[PDB]
Amino acid sequence: KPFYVNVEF
């Protein structure tokens, strides 16, 4: 899925 700099997987 798409990643975002401020969202931790």
Add this chain to the structure above:
Amino acid sequence: KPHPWFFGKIPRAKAEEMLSKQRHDGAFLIRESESAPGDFSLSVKFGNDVQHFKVLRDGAGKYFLWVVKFNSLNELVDYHRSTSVSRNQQIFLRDIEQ
């Protein structure tokens, strides 16, 4: 004057293509997320890279990127023209030139 940073529902890929051609650090746009309906995303150019940030929402309906909360997207954007959107890099928002 309408805001030059709202692009509506454009694909993540199109945002990258458009921003990679900008010449200044901080060039950005806000878009309505396609992967998460109802959510907004912020795409920014820094150096020769393009990064994406998810506009987060809290239990009080406020918008934020990390800690500071705002009542609107407009306020979140303006605040980040002088406060970095990143914790590891110093990225200040600057309007797209076009």
